[PDB]
């Protein structure tokens, strides 16, 4: 139809006219429009069939199809893709036809296949690891959730050792300890840490304003990245503020600190093994940074993590929580869906700004500023001080 | 934003101006636009989180939340819904917040919850049964598909007894025989048959033209509904052509024929137990009707079903296959996703128009006409004759 072509042309022009945050708003609008115009039959057909995307993406990941296709300079038929990757010709054909229908690849007028924007994404190892994480970990969790809540007469999940994860994987350990005994899952989790989300808090964080007259002399610590993974926040800090004095310390576990040495700058950033369930060793640091850490623990354990940092704070010291702050109403699917997943696997929760201040007050902390850096799904850096 | 409000209003006006087929075109365009304007990070987030909808819908079905909410004349807070349904107040709150974000319910400005169009859909027993089927029968099979194809070095699946279904449920039976030994699954499958798809082939089927000078005298059968479920095709046939003489026979298994007696007309439609893997008993009938039947069997078993009907055909007899006919290129997700699901659970396949004629030629049949009645996803009634 000419009308649907006019809609595509029109919405494309509007998307290119705004920024990434305007585009995120448009995508949520297209999603609500789809859900509001589907017939009752289409609704069930949509929920049933969108499950296939994760499973089919995993199949393509196991075959290296997205990586191989991202390096092809010419359209490929189904037969050669099946032969080069070692797959049955008929099986490959049906997979590609499905992928093309959900834009996982692109199909040409002569029934050949090229890469789409989703194909390039699935070839990036950090993002491909996120999709495999969804298939092999959270899917099973999610699938055990409804029968788990029925047997327990629908309780409020508040314990990391009593949630759907235990029934899903037939163990009594929590998700963190159980992961260490699984080598292939640890390997994938390591690749997953190499993906750097963008933008980061430094795009709106007024460092100099929050710094004040704090002095790095003699050799105080400027930035302590507690559970910092590959140290992306540390790296982006030295890049944006290379002249700012003060130590920049990446704290994590020895396994991931060893992996981070490959991509760390030769100087500027210290690697320091630390378990944040234990007292913080660095004293009087300006910023203690927690990005996507406290959302993986229930309120009683997230408080313990904060209670181990408080004894090491000066009056100039600030605890910075970089995490999602969903609104009290009108929350988007990207911040309510994660809330259900971490509840089922970790017994934790997403927290509104109010739930953050209530958790922080129990540690003796007080909110000083809140600097959002994503829209419409809110990721903010919350600056906390003593008193 | 004012911009996203203008898009919603504009597409709503265009949606109400066209028919159901035009709206299906618009929804598919909105989906392609969503997939093409999402950041690489959003793509992974979408596949991860859209999985929750099936799990969350199953939870709401287990609580009767969608049925209860569809009967409320005033907005309900999370606390009152939790108490009436026997659910934890905090657990209910997070569930409603997630449902609201995916339009599974609607949230009000004062944080209360009412029904949406999806809520009414999930309250219809036939559609709720379709969602429960996806959770308990489809989802597991899919979860087992990628590891199944890896162990077998990615073969072409052509056998109903050697697919992901066997690994998913740790049995050696095919899906049909294993289903009979499961009481709760049989009950849900029975409710699933009560949902009537719309429109049906009678919206474009030229009965009088295809009927010709066929005489019902002495007592020939006009319509034989082979595997007809609740007999919806039979009922809509007596309704649209009530004066057309001839017997209208609904054929299925004793379990579902007995369940269909509740909604069958008092007269007009005969119920006849029959197993379509056995020779057809009704002789010289005008139309032998197969709706969504041959889609569930591989080529070797689907042919036997046709080979059992051929011996009962006159020269005037016609076999009518009502099924999906996806195009050779550009197939929509609704007809490629089902192809992957029936491959994984039943070892069968969706068939293009030529693949249908190739299957019918092996039975001695010849395509006479093809009457589409859905767009853009093609469901057609294909009229076959002998020779
Ligand atoms: N007990 C513990 N002590 C210290 N670090 C831990 C820990 N348990 C988990 N972690 C670390 O916490 C990290 C969470 S992933 C978050 C990484 C970083 N905050 C970012 O967003 O870029 C993982 O890298 C993991 O190694
Ligand atoms: N071996 C068999 N013999 C006869 N009917 C069978 C059968 N195996 C399955 N069926 C029936 O075939 C139907 C498939 S779903 C049927 C939907 C219906 N024919 C429609 O037009 O929409 C079920 O009702 C099931 O009971």
Residue numbers in the entry:
A (entry chain B), B (entry chain A): 1 to 387
From the manuscript:
Recently, the novel multifunctional S-adenosyl-1-methionine (SAM)-dependent enzyme LepI, located in the PKS-NRPS gene cluster for leporin biosynthesis, was characterized in Aspergillus flavus. LepI is considered as a SAM-dependent methyltransferase that can catalyze stereoselective dehydration via three pericyclic transformational processes: intramolecular Diels-Alder and hetero-Diels-Alder reactions and a retro-Claisen rearrangement. The overall structure was found to be largely similar to that of SAM-dependent enzymes,28–31 exhibiting a core α/β fold of alternating β strands (β1–β7) and α helices (α1–α19). This structure exhibiting α helices and β sheets comprises an all-helix amino-terminal domain (NTD), a carboxy-terminal domain including a substrate-binding site, and a SAM-binding site, which is formed by a seven-stranded β sheet rounded with five helices.
To better understand the mechanism underlying LepI inhibition by SAH, we determined the structure of SAH-bound LepI at a 2.7 Å resolution. SAM or SAH binding with the enzyme occurs at the inner surface of the pocket and is primarily mediated via ionic bonds, hydrogen bonds and π–π interactions. No hydrogen bonds form between Leu292 or Ile293 and SAH because of the absence of a methyl group, which decreases the binding affinity between the region (amino-acid residues 291–296) and SAH. However, based on structural observation, one additional salt bond appears to form between Arg291 and SAH. Although SAH-mediated LepI inhibition probably proceeds via the failure of a stable interaction between SAH and LepI. Overall, the present results suggest that SAM may stabilize one active state among many available LepI conformations through substrate mimicry, thereby activating the pericyclic reaction; however, SAH cannot completely activate the pericyclic reaction of LepI because it lacks of sulfonium moiety for catalysis, whereas MTA occupies the substrate site.
